[PDB]
Design a binder for this molecule. Structure first.
Ligand code: CAC
Ligand code: CAC
Ligand code: CAC
Ligand code: CAC
Ligand code: CL
Ligand code: CL
Ligand code: CL
Ligand code: CL
Ligand code: CL
Ligand code: CL
Ligand code: CL
Ligand code: CL
Ligand code: ZN
Ligand code: ZN
Ligand code: ZN
Ligand code: ZN
Lengths: 351, 351, 351, 351
């Protein structure tokens, strides 16, 4: 079977592997549409989760079930499915503690292109199909569906972590596709003022679409001072980190008011320490809670998000700026995420 | 000073009282626009909070500050203000425990036309002005502003109490103005499917506007069975009670799935017991949490809600179906709430 | 295989059934020590969960694993195990929503002597052994261990549901073994004053041991008035319901202060409605949250509770008032729970 | 009036000031017993909250009310009172948001020897007496009472922030008096295993008394590896930081399991950045929540803690290792906190 892989740190290529086989509770799925992610660039080009050998990349797919194990009851060959990027082992003690994302170890609910061969292959394997898949609606555009699997869940998780009160003022630091979904998620948690920080015009337009009331361009000067000035020295109720380097932790702390929340969903690839500033964290005592969480997955999450899309709670179409046709364009698509052209949000390859 | 009052249970009339005087921390406010509430009908005509003598009614007003005490710093004569219907005593132990609504006793944060002369008078008194008032924006229509003071805060509080996950399915039982705001609030907590229960066409149109995906008319048959059928036997994640008689508690319990929330914001005036059904409450063990809460007030709540309106998170204009001009029309306006014409949601009297 | 069963409502007897067989993920366990529960009296003699045919009773056991399925990795034949009375299906959507106790339906995480043949048999079946068993410590008395499986988890769950702040005043309504564990659990959530309501001297002594600061005997007069008098009209922060008839709901509501919690863990068998009083529930608005929950189970819960016992956080020995030797005494033991002698808390049959 | 003061950074001395006067809502209190705090050493000798001029030190006192304002109703001259070190302005928007500790600005609920003349004076001023004082019980030893005002509330707040499940494994980093109270607080939140990190024998004995099951001495080697070894590679559910330098943040992150909580109550005086390690924080995604909070105060907190002591939930006497008699010994007492003799936990000066 063919797949586009991380040969090792800094090295991409097409490889050939054995087609995976389903256990009693698993499914084999062939991709129908896929998207590459900035996370795979951190993983390959920064070595941010350590080295790998011949790991097929990608974790954002809608697919067709081709094969299911003997104990699979709700999915069958031919079913069209939304595959959440996080596919936990539901039989784990971490699940019993309330942390599906870390079933059997830190980040280990997120398998695809963390450590498990991903979706950029002729087929891929889903553990526990009945618990980790959702049916794709008949009329749902594939490219919008693909945005559910990671961008929507992660951005929304930033808003969830932020523990927003109705009418809260929220800053979103970074308006790549995850931050855009954080903007929309903040709105769908009842945020009033939403201050989006970023400068790429395509992203700014999308941020405004999704609910941003204010846009902060770092080229006008320090972000901290800009935000403090917008809020008349009060700061924000919550800051969602959806991108940046290590220093953005310190920025987030400095703009959040006492009692507020810093909610990280950014995958940091560079810097071995994320700085928390002493004075602006109240020398340890400011009740500025710092969170940082991998997106939830599983069937329940996938269905609930899917149904938000069905009921027009968010329009995912705005994220999709590039569409390609055919398996081979996966390569070109991933390299867009590396190279970062001004007009890109997300790319989808429809096979 | 003139006001429209509860003479006692079942008896309304205009009365004359001394104009109130501000303590060091208080304001005297003259109404600019007011709305009557169904709660005052429960209070007067059902005796639902006990008898009263000569209590001026009303608790929904935007006003002009005419006089402030010596220790008031943020409001001054001439300021135009949104007055939250709940005006807590902030120096109370209940506030220290996190329950502003019950400062100095059960429901005692809600003063106006609970026990304190209300807003249907030439002037009224606000305790602790700096903590219990918000500035009215220059361009904000008075009639929309008045909807902040009770309908928005109460309906939104139903959504808050419901403890909705992103993508949850919510039922709203009753689509009077409080239920309409519960619909909008559920949407602004990220609800997917929102099932609104009610039959008055004006309310149904508003419910759909505010985010209802499904409408349930009791004239088609039992509500429980209808809802269970819509959700394919799963029930709903949360049911918000925004109206009905005592029996609606039992309905709410029967439609909520195990682990879900029944969130009441209805002011019950009739029936001395609200029934919780044994079997459908899992004989005590179904984790169906039952909440029932008075709306928050105070300056912070008022400002945060006001700012949600400024940033176009909700459009309150749809609630206002009747507008009158002049103090004397307060009487006619309140009697609309008693008589309940098919085309009424809320009435506002602009003085 | 022999077991002591519910023949049907009002009818007990010994029966013969096929010995159960383990699926790939299950274990067959033979009891080493067992206890009967008041819940089985509700189930059999009140028909509180509907009729049954030939259901082996009991859900409180420590056992020896005799057989495990091919996919079981952490338990093996010969292992001595604490079996939590609640053994969820971990692969369920309710688990994904955070409600293990209702995996695959209301109460359906609690299988043994709800609907599944229980522990009063020569052998019983545990679903998903690796996720639903805990190792019994070598030196832990069997009879103390058995108290973990239901009494400790349920009583502690009442304290968990009560959402106690450090220093809160808690009432416990009923001091049978579940209420006794609620007393201990309240103490281990940092309760200050703990007011235990009950009159059996053996239970009173145990309540005082476990942390009760005040004892209320209903024979001295109405409980509501007694509690209100003890707390100088303030009421309690939380009331845990661990026994009583339907009316105790109303008592609990009347003694809890505004903003407080009524936390039920009682299995109600009689009365089709549990009354919530209108005026004392603030006509729907008093923020008196009413909870009612089945005890958690699974391996994680079992291990965490076991380790609390290992570290001397609670002494379970006080609950065990009667010990019998041999399988046949199960019958006599269960009938004690029906007949309720003054000196009984819990009975354990050591096989 | 005489007081022992921070002349400025690095400079202590006795000074003379005007005796303060009560506003309508305030009290003037004369100390009956006082304790010095390590925080005042950070403040004076590290300049950790910036420079000061002639600020009377100390924030741990039991006193006698000598004078009250005209609007004070619950306290009067002669009353003996426990003064919480945190005395919020209850009329603030931060209080409305749920953060009394930051009323009118970051840390600004903690006034005494942060910015307001403290308790090491012939008299001191308490803002809002009715909301910020508690009656001292007649038979309560003064020196035990003084431990309520800061050590108990702060250490307990570390346990509160840790959001401990019943049976959780907790590490406490630092076993000075705050960490000792964190140990006791963890126990009173139902912790099972409690791993206390420290090496001073007097503190170790107290840690064991208060509930520590394991003691970790850094002189045996790296703390991280020791803790990971104790927990068999699982890490701890929560780590409470009650002392250390800046690096302890990174240690806390490395020992907490995914989904766990790092709960800081340490007042950091040195280092401008507290490091959060990238890999062990799951590159931003490990759901290791980092909290850091000033202790709550006010009358409600003071009464609830006082009542925990009355009901023998914790014994504070173990903290008091040194007692002096007479106002002048304040100087000697504070310098003990600077110099740190092996046998010191807390010192109390009884005037
Ligand atoms: C599954 As991911 C860290 O790219 O949001
Ligand atoms: C202040 As009201 C009970 O009418 O929402
Ligand atoms: C498992 As039970 C309802 O007897 O605590
Ligand atoms: C009031 As303090 C920071 O010394 O615990
Ligand atoms: Cl975990
Ligand atoms: Cl992104
Ligand atoms: Cl309260
Ligand atoms: Cl209404
Ligand atoms: Cl569920
Ligand atoms: Cl019991
Ligand atoms: Cl705040
Ligand atoms: Cl300390
Ligand atoms: Zn991704
Ligand atoms: Zn009203
Ligand atoms: Zn039982
Ligand atoms: Zn201190």
């Amino acid at each position: 079977m063919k797949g586009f892989a991380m040969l090792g740190i800094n090295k991409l290529g097409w490889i050939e592997k054995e087609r995976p086989v389903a256990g009693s509770y698993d499914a084999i799925v062939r991709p129908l549409a896929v998207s590459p992610c900035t996370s795979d660039i951190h993983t390959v080009f920064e070595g941010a989760l350590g080295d790998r050998k011949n790991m097929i990349l990608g974790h954002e797919a809608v697919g067709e079930v081709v094969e299911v194990g003997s104990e699979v009851k709700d999915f069958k060959p031919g079913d069209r499915v939304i595959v959440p990027c996080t596919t936990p082992d539901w039989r784990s003690l971490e699940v019993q503690a309330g942390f599906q994302q870390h079933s059997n170890g830190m980040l280990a609910g997120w398998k695809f292109s963390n450590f498990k061969d991903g979706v950029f292959g002729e087929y891929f394997h889903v553990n526990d199909a009945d618990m980790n898949l959702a049916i794709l609606p008949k009329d749902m555009p594939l490219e919008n569906a693909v945005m559910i699997t990671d961008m929507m869940t992660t951005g929304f998780h930033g808003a969830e972590l932020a523990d927003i009160e109705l009418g809260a003022t929220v800053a979103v630091l970074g308006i790549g596709p995850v931050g855009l979904m954080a903007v929309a998620g903040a709105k769908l948690r009842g945020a009033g003022r939403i201050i989006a920080v970023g400068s790429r015009p395509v992203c700014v337009d999308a941020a405004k679409y999704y609910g941003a009331t204010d846009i902060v361009n770092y080229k006008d000067g320090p972000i901290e001072s800009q935000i403090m000035n917008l809020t008349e020295g009060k700061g924000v109720d919550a800051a969602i980190i959806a991108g940046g380097n290590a220093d953005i932790m310190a920025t987030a702390v400095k703009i959040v008011k006492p009692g507020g929340t810093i909610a990280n969903v950014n995958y940091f690839g560079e810097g071995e320490v994320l700085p928390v500033p002493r004075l602006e964290w109240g020398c340890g005592m400011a009740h500025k809670t710092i969170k940082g969480g991998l997106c939830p997955g599983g069937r329940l999450r996938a269905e609930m998000l899917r149904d938000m899309v069905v009921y027009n709670r968010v329009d995912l179409s705005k994220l999709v700026t590039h569409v390609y046709h055919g398996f081979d364009h996966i390569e070109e698509a991933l390299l867009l995420m590396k190279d970062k052209p001004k007009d890109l949000i997300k790319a989808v390859v429809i096979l």
